[PDB]
Design a protein around this ligand. Structure first.
Ligand code: NI
Ligand SMILES: [Zn+2]
Ligand SMILES: [Zn+2]
Ligand SMILES: [Zn+2]
Length: 269
């Protein structure tokens, strides 16, 4: 029932959005809508691949970073949990967060310690998974009862990294400033960085800048969950929000999460 002008307008709007995704550095990201005639999600936002810092936020200084030099040939050898200085932040059931497959081990907690730029290992160091980025080709699609969602296009073994939740790092102060502006917003892309000390009170907002994950939906039976991966082991005022698959993800399966913090990880209870 759309008239020529509108129909063309929508056409062009969807194509613009597809253009925008083509410019994402990484595996493919596609846009589909088999439900209605909505072109695509709002274009008023920019895809990024690194946090965008904002006024008033003091980022962890890299200058005071610890760098492991336990890089023999390959990476750091996942058999030497007692050689890395990236792991010195805790010694109990000591081990690298990942296995050989690059998947997140089942005995790994809600905290991942990856190698820094101050380490001597190459980018292939088995302890630089998150840093390497997405590897799964994803598709933004229109769900029937919920807004837009994202499903995988490939099978993902539980424990597979997916992507970090990117966006502007704002102080819980301005956070609330924006909360005073959220009108009839169906979704409010806020993510508090309070895994540790609550003094920093920093939050990630993907309202205007973010990653594909800014399209992920909440759910009760999620297939992905946040893993606080840190590189500046000494200052966790800011860290990476990593999404890993908690269970096998079937191709074309929608990805969903529900942050519970370290209050769903370490407890079988
Ligand atoms: Ni089409
Ligand atoms: Zn190491
Ligand atoms: Zn290291
Ligand atoms: Zn390393």
């Amino acid at each position: 029932k759309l008239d020529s002008y509108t129909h063309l307008s929508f056409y062009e709007k969807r194509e613009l959005f597809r253009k925008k995704l083509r410019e994402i550095e990484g595996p493919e990201v596609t846009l589909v809508n088999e439900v209605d005639d909505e072109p695509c999600p709002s274009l008023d936002f920019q895809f990024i691949s690194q946090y965008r810092l904002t006024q008033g936020v003091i980022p962890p200084d890299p200058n005071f970073q610890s760098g492991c030099n336990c890089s023999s040939l390959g990476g750091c050898d996942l058999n030497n949990p007692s050689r890395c200085e990236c792991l010195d932040d805790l010694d109990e059931p000591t081990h690298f967060a990942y296995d050989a497959q690059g998947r997140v081990r089942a005995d790994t907690g809600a905290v991942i310690y990856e190698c820094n730029s101050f380490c001597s290992c190459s980018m292939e160091c088995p302890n630089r998974v998150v840093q390497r980025g997405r590897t799964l080709p994803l598709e933004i699609f229109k769900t029937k009862e919920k807004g837009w969602g994202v499903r995988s296009l490939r099978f993902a073994p539980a424990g597979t990294f997916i992507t970090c939740y990117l966006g502007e790092v704002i102080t819980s102060a301005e956070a609330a400033k924006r909360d005073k502006n959220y009108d009839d917003d169906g979704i409010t892309y806020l993510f508090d960085l309070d895994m540790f000390d609550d003094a920093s009170e920093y939050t990630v907002d993907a309202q205007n800048y973010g990653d594909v994950s800014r399209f992920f939906n909440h759910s009760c039976s999620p297939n992905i969950a946040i893993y606080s991966a840190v590189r500046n082991h000494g200052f966790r005022t800011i860290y990476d929000l990593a999404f890993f698959a908690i269970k096998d993800i079937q191709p074309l399966e929608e990805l969903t999460f529900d942050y519970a913090g370290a209050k769903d990880f370490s407890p079988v209870q």
